[PDB]
Design a protein around this nucleic acid. Structure first.
Ligand code: MG
Ligand code: MG
Ligand code: MG
Ligand code: MG
Ligand code: MG
Ligand code: MG
Ligand code: MG
Ligand code: MG
Ligand code: MG
Ligand code: MG
Ligand code: MG
Ligand code: MG
Ligand code: MG
Ligand code: MG
Ligand code: MG
Ligand code: MG
Ligand code: MG
Ligand code: MG
Ligand code: MG
Ligand code: MG
Ligand code: MG
Ligand code: MG
Ligand code: MG
Ligand code: MG
Lengths: 144, 187, 258, 123
RNA sequence: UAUCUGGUUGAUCCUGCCAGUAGUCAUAUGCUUGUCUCAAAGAUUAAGCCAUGCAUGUCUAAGUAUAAGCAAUUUAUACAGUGAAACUGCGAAUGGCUCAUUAAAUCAGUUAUCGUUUAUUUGAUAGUUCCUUUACUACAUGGUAUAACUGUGGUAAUUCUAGAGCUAAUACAUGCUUAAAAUCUCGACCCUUUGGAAGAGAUGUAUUUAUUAGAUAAAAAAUCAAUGUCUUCGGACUCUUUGAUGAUUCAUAAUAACUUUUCGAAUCGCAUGGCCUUGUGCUGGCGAUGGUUCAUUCAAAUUUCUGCCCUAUCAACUUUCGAUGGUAGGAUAGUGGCCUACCAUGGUUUCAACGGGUAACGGGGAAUAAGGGUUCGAUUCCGGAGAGGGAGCCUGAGAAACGGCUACC
RNA sequence: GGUCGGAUUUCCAACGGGGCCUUUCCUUCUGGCUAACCUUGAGCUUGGCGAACCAGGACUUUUACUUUGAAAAAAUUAGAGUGUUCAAAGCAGGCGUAUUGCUCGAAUAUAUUAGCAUGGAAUAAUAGAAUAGGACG
RNA sequence: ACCCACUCGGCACCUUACGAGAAAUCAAAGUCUUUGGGUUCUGGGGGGAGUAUGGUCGCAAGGCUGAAACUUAAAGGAAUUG
RNA sequence: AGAAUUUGGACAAACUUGGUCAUUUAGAGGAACUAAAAGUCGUAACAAGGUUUCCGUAGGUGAACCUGCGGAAGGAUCAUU
RNA sequence: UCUAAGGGUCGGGUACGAUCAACUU
RNA sequence: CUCUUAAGGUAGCCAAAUGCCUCGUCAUCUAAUUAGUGACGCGCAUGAAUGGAUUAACGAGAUUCCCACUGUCCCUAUCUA
């Protein structure tokens, strides 16, 4: 995670329509909006108590998780906020009455609320197209 | 013309896809507005399913809002001072979203005197009754107070001039103002 | 392609219309209306193919243009006006009234109702949502929007429409033990007294259903139409009452009388 | 654009073109039943072949199979109806071994012959 | 109907192929052809080229008629009967044809739009618009041009048109007529402490921006900042309004403004009825057409997962100038490297990427089969693509439209 | 065969299901039905422990496989019924005092894999407490 | 160091055919139409031909990979009698 | 209100010149293969084929082929306690 | 006429600031 | 087959800077070629450290063709010291 030095881009990174009025003073100086992605997935404490913005986050962002829920093994963490998983499966050829190993590489988006290493197993929830190849968002990490 | 389809540029593996489906209209694009300042000129764009769209050019004024005070005013635009996407839009004074601009700051100044009444920068008893009740809230900030002396305010264009035909924004305050001031004062 | 289609070939029309594949190249394409194209009677099939009150499509136009036929109390001169589930058809001549219900075989059956039973209809609510100016409304399965409903009305319930004014007379709540009518799927046209339903957060609810003869089957929630409390229903069920006899038992009944 | 008219062929030629046994038995049938062709014998063999194709699929199933009970009775009923299947043989196992010319016995000219009225099968 | 036979030897048993054998909604061809039903049919080569003639036009009771059209209504001096032409409104984006392109592309099954457009149909749904809003004003209703038409004409020719003179709208372009009540801001004066006022303005919808609410597992007390509906100023205190989803910045409402400003009936047919202070006074029916927003239906666009033939004498490919991802913006009906600026070096591949080939549109299916398979699918249905090859675009809800236009070849 | 070749019961059996005990938690709280209720009122009465039905819960080892179910348009394939004179076909048709009319049908099956729900839990993998942050508390 | 008995491992050998094979023969070449312990590689009539061409390795000789046009009704294995 | 015209941009047909790939096709001459014909020369193999045959490799010779080194039995020896 | 990248020297109890100066892209 | 030698020119290459006949023959290059290149080889009189045959790079070396270029030329004119 490393908190990605939040104010680093050329534009001011903030959650839209989340206004922290300076006229009044109270606890939690910076208002943080968040939500539960549903389907039983919990919101990690990093998302609730973090400072990242990540408008593509399924908990603190503007994207919603709906559609397919998949699981895969991480094979690449070399992008920024995006990883590649490998989904293995067995394809049945009816002629020989037996299977063959196949795989697909799914690029999925990882929020700073999660920390993912190569080889870990994660579950990804479907969202609207984020990039040219990305269609899924990491929602739960099952390994470390 | 300008197309938004994807059967052009290569897939994720790097393969070049063959030609298929001569360009369709429902995947078209158009040319940018590149809105300027002064002598308002807005053209009409007929989009899909009727749905008239406004291509703003040469906008003069705008509706800028003061989030802390919850008021909006119509004020003129002086020029563009910072743009996170391209520095040329600053140099050419192009009006786009998320562009930091100066504003006249006069309508905001006159409203403050009517509402709070103390001062900015530097008669009947129905007035000071409101002013007495509307007290302890005229201590806005030291980074916004000093701008009223110069007569210009750092605003941020929250609207899409090339889509709606309007240049509407908000006055930078608090952390957002402190972020962009460091960018502007650097030399 | 390039715009909406307007022709419906035979062998591509819904199979429950019972259109002979020969004797014609096209089929009546139902117009835009309250009901889906896939589930729609429209009158030309009803008047000619079901009631034998016409010999051609020209005689159907002659009947309709004289304001004899009416759907839900309105003339509906359109020849391919889509008439769907629970729609009430009134003919001034022959003093006949009809209600569109599915036969146990999955087909729209000719059902004759009395004058009083033609003075209302049931509609499954599809969404309860706030309109403009904070006015709640309910959307039934036939596209009917009714403002100011009962606050206790929720989705998947059945309301009763007056058919003289769009007002709601009474509503049946979607609870376990209610008599239901299966609309859509392999179990189309069965009546089965809900026992329980499965939640399945994410979509595609499932409900378990067992008819009077204690035959249990499961269908998706969107195919279920509650038609009243167990026992007495709120409408006159067609002959058979949705039993779904097996083919072995069906032939013995056909062999009982001959 | 119109629904095509379904058609099918109703005869099967034998695998071997020339064998003495079949070329004799088939001609014996034609002469003794007054048939014009061999195609009129291939037709009965084809029709019987489909009968024993369905009866084998039924017998290989379990007893009291709901499909077998409905289809087995219906298949026996048709053969009993036209007289090919006798009343004493309704087990669905005598269907598989009926005969070739049991069907030829129930054709019109044979039965017209049987009740007099022709005094020869060719008449 | 789970079957084989002839051919290597002087003779034998094998391996092995050649030949025979049966079928083909597989073609072609030869000889021959009496009857009824049914029926494919310029796909293969040449998505090669086309004379000619047709294939898209359309009206009611209910948009506009002085036809200098036809006839008599005779109820009619404004019209009111039928009706050419033309303006207007729709449709022409359906259908029909073909299979050239196309190998994760199309497509099949399965998902999503909490990521968008939607003419038409069906169901609901604008009392708030005299703008210095007390003469500015027509609201028993306000203007302009023009077609058709008369006549002058030009070219060899085209569904070519010009100048002159008329006249209509559901054409174009303007435009008011209806209650209240409540609330929020300004705000005269008494003059005061507990402060209330006359009066004025604002308050539909649509657009844009910012902000607020949109809550909800459970029970009791401490004094303050000051009473907060009414006080027996001790405080009894409750009513405190709050929907849906698995999930939302959702539906919805409110505040402050913005718009060069959308919409909020100057439209048509038939019936003519009631009330009086009988005035062309006031009311009053069944429809048609149109119109803002939502829902619905007919759709569209994008989209999830799995699945495609032969090839390594194709092993590395993609990223100059877009490749993979981030931030911001522009564009779009919307999401998205769709495009742009800055940034990072990423992405696919022996589980076969990439390249080449296809005498490859893909399925539902077809032929032959004991079981397992093999071959085929231009073509009666579904989806896609194209109108000689390219590209571009107007109209419109919907077209990169070709029985539409523009340019090149 | 207690009816005249059709089914009921108390039956000696077989085969497939469910619950309980034998060391065998094979997850549950706010609350309703309190339910099957030690509930008993004189032989049908006032009061037992929540999923047998529910709204929200911390949590929740993962698959492969197999059964059942929803989906897999129509046509075509198999297949039931039926006078196209038979047949290929088609979805018709049939019965009356035929003067008024009445009425049966237009089924059913198959449809890989992928996705979805579901019971099983053998077979084949995967994980857990070892320089104990291991569980109950 | 020899002799006798047993045993594990190795090079083989003799007999027979339960079995296999077209046969020659085989204790595996058996437990294969009563057809499935795991796995790698290679062949699909005889010639043209291991030839052409393109690659790749070698200093070279050459190695590895490797066609097609064309042509043919038989080539081939083991035994039998001359 | 507004025609002809005009600035810049994007989309971008098409032409020319090259490059690259692919498919056909001419070519003096050179060198193979196949088939036919009673062609000329020899006799390399099948018997110990009259020098046993064959494999790899190298050289040589009209031609089959010969010779050296190593190897095999598909040998003409299953055999010398 | 502008824009961007490429430095030296001073500065913390036991990330940032000041100042100065290069032609290279 | 015969005469003959010390041995009778092997592998290679060739009208080559080495071929007389000769402007050899065939192909290409051109409108036309005693030029050039590619083949052929009874080669007056090629040929193996008289070194043979090749050969990347290099050359103020000999030669041929092609593109660009041009007063070399058609066909000359003009200007300056
Ligand atoms: Mg079409
Ligand atoms: Mg229609
Ligand atoms: Mg031989
Ligand atoms: Mg012989
Ligand atoms: Mg053959
Ligand atoms: Mg073709
Ligand atoms: Mg509507
Ligand atoms: Mg973006
Ligand atoms: Mg981006
Ligand atoms: Mg093709
Ligand atoms: Mg089609
Ligand atoms: Mg097209
Ligand atoms: Mg053509
Ligand atoms: Mg076009
Ligand atoms: Mg045409
Ligand atoms: Mg030993
Ligand atoms: Mg040994
Ligand atoms: Mg073979
Ligand atoms: Mg071979
Ligand atoms: Mg031999
Ligand atoms: Mg010889
Ligand atoms: Mg000889
Ligand atoms: Mg030998
Ligand atoms: Mg050999």
């Amino acid at each position: 995670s490393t908190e990605l030095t939040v104010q680093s881009e050329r534009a001011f990174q903030k959650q839209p329509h989340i206004f922290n009025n300076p006229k009044v003073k109270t606890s939690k100086r910076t208002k943080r909006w968040y939500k539960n992605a549903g389907l039983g997935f919990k919101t990690p404490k990093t998302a609730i108590e973090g400072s990242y913005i990540d408008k593509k986050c399924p908990f603190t962002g503007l994207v919603s998780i709906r559609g397919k829920i998949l699981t895969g093994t991480v094979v690449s963490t070399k992008m920024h906020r995006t990883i590649v998983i490998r989904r293995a499966y067995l394809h049945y050829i009816p002629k020989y009455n037996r299977y063959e190993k196949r795989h697909k590489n799914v690029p999925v988006h990882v929020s700073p609320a999660f920390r993912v290493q190569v080889g870990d197993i994660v579950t990804v929830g479907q969202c609207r197209p984020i990039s040219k190849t990305v269609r899924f968002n990491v929602v739960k990490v099952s390994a470390a | 013309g300008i197309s938004r389809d994807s059967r052009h540029k290569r897939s994720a593996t790097g393969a070049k896809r063959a030609q298929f489906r001569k360009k369709r209209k429902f995947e078209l694009g158009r040319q940018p507005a590149n809105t300027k300042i002064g002598a308002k000129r807005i053209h009409s764009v007929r989009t899909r399913g009727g749905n008239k769209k406004y291509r703003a050019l040469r906008i003069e004024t705008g509706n800028f809002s003061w989030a802390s005070e919850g008021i909006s005013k119509k004020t003129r635009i002086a020029g563009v001072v910072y743009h996170p996407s391209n520095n040329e839009l600053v140099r050419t004074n192009t009006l786009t979203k998320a562009a930091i601009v100066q504003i006249d700051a006069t309508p905001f100044r006159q409203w403050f005197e009517a509402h709070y009444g103390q001062t900015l920068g530097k008669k009947s008893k129905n007035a000071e009754r409101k002013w007495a009740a509307r007290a302890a809230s005229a201590k806005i900030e030291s980074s916004v107070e000093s701008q009223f002396s110069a007569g210009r305010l750092y605003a941020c264009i929250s609207s899409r001039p090339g889509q709606s035909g309007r240049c509407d924004g908000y006055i930078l305050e608090g952390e957002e103002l402190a972020f962009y001031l460091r960018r502007l004062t650097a030399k | 392609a390039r715009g909406p289609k307007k022709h419906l070939k035979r062998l591509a029309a819904p199979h429950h219309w019972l259109l002979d594949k020969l004797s014609g190249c096209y089929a009546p394409r139902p117009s835009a209306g309250p009901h889906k194209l896939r589930e729609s009677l429209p009158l030309i099939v009803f008047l000619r193919n079901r009631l034998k009150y016409a010999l051609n499509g020209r005689e159907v136009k002659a009947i309709l243009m004289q304001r004899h036929v009416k759907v839900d109390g309105k003339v509906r001169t359109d020849t391919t006006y889509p008439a769907g589930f629970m729609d009430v058809i009134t003919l001034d001549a022959t003093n006949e009234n009809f209600r569109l219900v599915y036969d146990v075989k999955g087909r729209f059956a000719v059902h004759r109702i009395t004058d009083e039973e033609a003075s209302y209809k049931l509609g499954k609510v599809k969404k309860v949502q706030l309109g403009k100016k904070g006015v709640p409304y309910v959307v039934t399965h036939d596209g009917r929007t009714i403002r100011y409903p009962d606050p206790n009305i929720k989705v998947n319930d059945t309301v009763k429409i007056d058919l003289a004014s769009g007002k709601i007379t009474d509503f049946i709540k979607f609870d376990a033990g209610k008599l239901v009518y299966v609309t859509g799927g392999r179990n189309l046209g069965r009546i089965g007294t809900i026992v329980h339903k499965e939640r399945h957060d994410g979509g595609f609810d499932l409900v378990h259903i067992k008819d009077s003869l204690d035959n249990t089957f499961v269908t998706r929630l969107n195919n279920v139409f509650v038609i009243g409390e167990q026992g007495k229903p709120y409408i006159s069920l067609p002959k058979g009452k949705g039993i779904k006899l097996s083919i072995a038992e069906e032939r013995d009944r056909r062999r009982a009388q001959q | 654009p119109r629904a095509p008219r379904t058609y099918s062929k109703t005869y099967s030629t034998p695998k071997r073109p020339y064998e003495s046994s079949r070329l004799d038995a088939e001609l014996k049938l034609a002469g003794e039943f007054g048939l014009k062709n061999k195609k009129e014998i291939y037709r009965i063999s084809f029709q019987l072949s489909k009968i024993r194709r369905a009866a084998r699929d039924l017998l290989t199933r379990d007893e009291k199979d709901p499909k077998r009970l409905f289809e087995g009775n219906a298949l026996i009923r048709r053969l009993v109806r036209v007289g090919v299947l006798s009343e004493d043989k309704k087990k669905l196992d005598y269907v598989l071994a009926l005969k070739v010319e049991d069907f030829l016995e129930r054709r019109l000219q044979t039965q017209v012959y049987k009740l007099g009225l022709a005094k020869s099968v060719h008449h």
